[PDB]
Amino acid sequence: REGILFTTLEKLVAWGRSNSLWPATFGLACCAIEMMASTDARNDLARFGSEVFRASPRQADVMIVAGRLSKKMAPVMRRVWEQMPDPKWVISMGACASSGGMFNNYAIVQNVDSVVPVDVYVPGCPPRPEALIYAVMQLQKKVRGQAYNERGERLPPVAAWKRTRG
Amino acid sequence: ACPAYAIYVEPAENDPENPVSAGERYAKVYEINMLRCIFCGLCEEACPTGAIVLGYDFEMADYEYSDLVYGKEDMLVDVVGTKPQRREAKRTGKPVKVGYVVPYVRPELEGFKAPTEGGK
Amino acid sequence: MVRVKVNDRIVEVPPGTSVMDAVFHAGYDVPLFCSEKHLSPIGACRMCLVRIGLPIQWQPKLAASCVTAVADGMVVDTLSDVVREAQAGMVEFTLLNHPLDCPTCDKGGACELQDRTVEYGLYEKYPLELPVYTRFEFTRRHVDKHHPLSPFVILDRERCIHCKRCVRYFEEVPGDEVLDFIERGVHTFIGTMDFGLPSGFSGNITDICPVGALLDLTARFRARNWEMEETPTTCALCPVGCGITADTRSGELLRIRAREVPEVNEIWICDAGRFGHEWADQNRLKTPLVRKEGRLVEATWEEAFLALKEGLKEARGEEVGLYLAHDATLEEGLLASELAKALKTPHLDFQGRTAAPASLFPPASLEDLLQADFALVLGDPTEEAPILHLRLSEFVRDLKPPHRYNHGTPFADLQIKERMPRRTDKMALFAPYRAPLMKWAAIHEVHRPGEEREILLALLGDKEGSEMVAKAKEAWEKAKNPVLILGAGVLQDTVAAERARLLAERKGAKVLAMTPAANARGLEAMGVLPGAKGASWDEPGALYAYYGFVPPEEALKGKRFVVMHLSHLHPLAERYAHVVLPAPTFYEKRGHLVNLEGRVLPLSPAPIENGEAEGALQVLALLAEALGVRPPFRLHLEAQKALKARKVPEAMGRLSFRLKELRPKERKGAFYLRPTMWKAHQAVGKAQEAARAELWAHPETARAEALPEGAQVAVETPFGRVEARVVHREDVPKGHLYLSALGPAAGLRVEGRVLV
Amino acid sequence: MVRVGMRAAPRVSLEALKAALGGLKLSEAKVYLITDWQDKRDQARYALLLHTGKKDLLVPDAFGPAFPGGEEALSELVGLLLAQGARRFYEAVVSPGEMTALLDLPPEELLKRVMAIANPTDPGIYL
Amino acid sequence: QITPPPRHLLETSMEAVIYHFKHYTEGFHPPKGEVYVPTESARGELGYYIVSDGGSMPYRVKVRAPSFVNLQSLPYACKGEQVPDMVAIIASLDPVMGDVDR
Amino acid sequence: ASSERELYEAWVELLSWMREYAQAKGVRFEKEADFPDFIYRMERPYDLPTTIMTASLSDGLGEPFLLADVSPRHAKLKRIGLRLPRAHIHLHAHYEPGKGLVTGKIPLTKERFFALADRAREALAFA
Amino acid sequence: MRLERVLEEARAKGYPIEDNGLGNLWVVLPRERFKEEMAHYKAMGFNFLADIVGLDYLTYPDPRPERFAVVYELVSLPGWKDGDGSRFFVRVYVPEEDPRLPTVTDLWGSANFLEREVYDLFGIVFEGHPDLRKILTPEDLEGHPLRKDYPLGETPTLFREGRYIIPAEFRAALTGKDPGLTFYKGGSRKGYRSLW
């Protein structure tokens, strides 16, 4: 029941969800290859708990928006995001997803927070694979409830808990 | 020359008694949106004083858009680390540890503090 | 017409065409430093050099195409290898001693030198041979840097390439020789002993200097030229409405510049229009206020309109006042007029309405002025309609409108020679003081206030005036097509305007009416004038009223409900107004205005941070609904349709409208409200002390009233209390004190008293 | 294309929008919530452009929490659009200097510009 | 006009500052004309149809996207093949959709 | 040769002299222009002791009455030059080793500079 | 080789031949003769159809016959049966209010997708197409992006305290018709070309 209502139990389940981040592959653009390189045999996102990679949205919690989110893919991704279990986290990978990138035009959503609740933002073009590990570590200590912004605020464990989805 | 248009410069006049820049003009506001920045190098290639020059840190992921606009005093050579790194050093009591090592820093980065080849 | 050939092309062209202008007319190009639009060309920069054949018989040496006339069937070569060689050489000579300040130069990308250099320099000399940019490896010229010549103008004597544009302008266009060189040879640098920059047209050199020597101090170190957000619009401070270009970036007004529109102003702006922009973005009202507990508090729009409904629930249509501001667009005046048709009230007016309507008279085209024979002026153009002075500089020198080429205003008009003589016999001026233009109008008689009407009588010929007045009568007679120019005193003094109308009809002659209000002729044309009762913009007659400016303090007293639509907050409002709302400035509105020559000019909106404002259109649409009367206007498009229906022509189209009704008012003459170019609300930053109030007196009158040469004397007027620096002047008649009326209260005579 | 409501009057604009909306079927209509300042929704203001395909509807910058009680009106508004069958919600980001003049442009320019610049939005962020 | 000035003489010549400034703000203006050059990519024939109008920015840039025309052969290729083989027969073509959609 | 250094060094001394005069007579001294090969040096080395190349003694009205310039680090025929505006007065100072700073062959003493500046103050300044 | 024979065939047919000094050839065919001529072009052995590039000449400083211009690219593979290697372009102007052009689907199936793109990017409808279905832009998108009267749709870049940038009013680089920040553009910045 939501991972709450005991001081030890919420710490425990937050620990589990933090290190057991099961990525949901959503490769969009050239960010995708520097995403996969965070799993190659120089630098693997295969230690923290993300070795296995369930392409299914019904089985993976972290959605890595790796590339430009073109508008014709937005509504589809929409349902794909709703086709995730509720304990889900959404990372915005790359400049084109986090921001509009250099493609300031009619074609691209200029910030993916519009359609999906973003957990962590990561600048870069392409973000070095180790920066992707840094972003998942950021998300790690966020879902543990150990993350603070520049204004001093603690951030909720799971973004996408605060939106009247519909 | 910024092809992504992430650089905004509000200028001002040097105060001769306590000047900040070498000429008669300095940058009162220098903010760069790391989410817009596509990391070209044209800013470095156009800078005639070598002031703005790309560095090395990549551990810059943060949680909030409006916090990813790095400011002048968040990029001056005096500083040691990225914004989330400094914020963690404050909320943690643990000094900044850079997660990269390089054989050496360029001359154009005079002053840039980094681990250098193992001399230390 | 005359035949010319540019390197491959044949052009028909009128004779007086400069070779450079014909070259551009063929679509070709040549560097340009010495010559300029509307300036007397002299071969100085030696940049315009072309090849000329006059038979194939090439000229022995290269002819200065900027100052070389054209002949029928003359061959012009601008592409010869030798031509580009010489052009690059001259460019290198010019660039020799520049201070290397481009990065910190606020002229930035908009430096004619930069562009001509990047165009013609470094001809491919004959491989991947290592090129060298500069050969001169000696020490460069260094002189005094960033010297403010005036609170508006900055001077960097290093960057000057010693063209003649600024001094040639100052001699020719304003007729104020307040700038010239000091030394000669290479040591030459610019200086003056006239430091305040007396000419009220000083700012325009700011734009002309092809280098960053002379810059706009008020826009120093804000942004680079290409970075600024450019919105072209029209300045509505005074009725000539020059075309301007407003540069804004990041929500605040950075810099105002001149926009070329030869119909009204060629490339010129007055110092007040161009440098008086600090007040737009500095401190202004962004929240509608409400008077509830004996004080003003920021309120929602809903609560403001609720209070409006309730305070006007029993508001009768014969007690509501509709008083608009002198910069009101055609749309606003038309809506107010239509509403007063519906909302039957006899008292509506606008801020700068004249007791004698300016619509009485046929508009005069300024190009018709250049073709005109004589100019009979009563009043001071420099203060009432500033750029007329500059247009007068074109007229009085026997200049005439150029032929309109394919590239518009010609680069080198041979009609303008240097140091041209200014005629003393082609115009006649009558002003209450020795007007600065009296230099060029020998026919002059310094009168006193309330004397105009008698001068007009004498010029009509029914009685005998002074020698000067009889001479002006004579010259007006001999003139076959003269132009009559009326000041603010006449337009506010019914009978004098009547006699002027009589003179300008009996002799076929157009009229220039210097309205104290900008869009006055449009509001008249759109129907803004009081009715029977007649509570005018200064009269405290109405019981409910809408005000868009600062009326006399006595105007407010007695009313039951008063609603002001301001942009800034005036103490007259936080103590007498019931509902105040934000109003956008003329910079940030959108619509059309009517010049004093009948030409409508657009206001495009500026991207300035207006706050939560709504245009006076929406304000009246909101105010009439509380009254039951459904307003016809809320948006701009319907306003454009109802305008075109009201028979107002397109932009730049001249609107023909005459008017026959006079509403005179007595004038209690003790103090004079001198018409001022500078406007009261412009006293911000660098205009603080420049747009100060002044009290001018004859030295005998000074000694009699004990007014020292430098005292800051406070004075009380129905228009408020203002303190003013005192000036002794020998031409002001005895017993009179000219108070500088820094508002659109020009030409008015009102009582008052001097506080201690 | 109609223009209903006024600036900074969430309740008046909302009630006029209820009345003028009626039983309009929005199965293929498009809703553009134009705003400024992409990130900071905490103080955001919102204008609405409703393109039904057969006629269009404009409401100026009168919605959003930047106005007192604007978020409650915006909540009712998005709930209303969702009730009538809307599926496609869009947000266009324009400069504050644009938003005000934009409502004075001809219908074709305003509508073309907005439909060109639109960002697909999750309506949940405004509920 | 084609290459920015060398970085060392920015402190010697005015012309250096002019060319650096203009090139990095405006750039250069090539002549009016259209151009194309082909090359061999890991996915076949590539080229740019570049129309320049004499301005500092190209008038139009069209890309001959090799994977874009190459993809038309999918219904033919995978016609009659197995369902699993529809994957290899795509991978055998090496598509890059950043190239195709473009 | 390397005398350049002492020249620039002596140049500093000259500036020092200038400042003293300004502080005595209560006249505004202003740093006019710095070294370009020091502003525009990006990674390049800079060996000069100061960054300032041109300065002046300005009256109350801002018009200078005494101007001084020194040749840059990379220019040929290195010198120091002096000028009186409006007075067609120009001086060419060198630095000869052992003797000192010379106007031609005449050494340039501090008191000579003071007399020239005082004459300038009395004569040229408007206020 | 077949390019030379195209030249000797067309020049007698009154077809102008556009050439820049770089080695690229344009052959302008009118609307009608286009279809049968290019059918013969395939019959001449033009196997390979590289490009179909759509052009909007609206904002070009010099005017042109028509707003839209469609260019096909015909080639002959050097390594096939009879490989010459002749590659050249065929330009055909298309009216703004008559965006008609018969398809080359019957000759090449390659123009299946390519032409569709031009119907997506431009208002050009290609007659004789198997299926003109919008390829790239979203289904609900209204209009044709690449024509100059269609906005690019830029969105401002954001900063800390109200400070923003609108790029189209920010860009310092000049297009062909933008005269520049001085009174005009001449010399190198009205076109520059080095002489080898």
Ligand code: SF4
């Ligand atoms: S940020 Fe760079 S690497 Fe990532 S999708 Fe955008 S262009 Fe590609």
Ligand code: SF4
């Ligand atoms: S690398 Fe420099 S020029 Fe490129 S986007 Fe970043 S700030 Fe702009």
Ligand code: SF4
């Ligand atoms: S200051 Fe400017 S306008 Fe005047 S002569 Fe020098 S370059 Fe020409």
Ligand code: SF4
């Ligand atoms: S005036 Fe022109 S050449 Fe001189 S520093 Fe300014 S932009 Fe550069």
Ligand code: SF4
């Ligand atoms: S003369 Fe009048 S309209 Fe022209 S700039 Fe000055 S105040 Fe504005």
Ligand code: FES
């Ligand atoms: S010499 Fe200046 S252009 Fe003729």
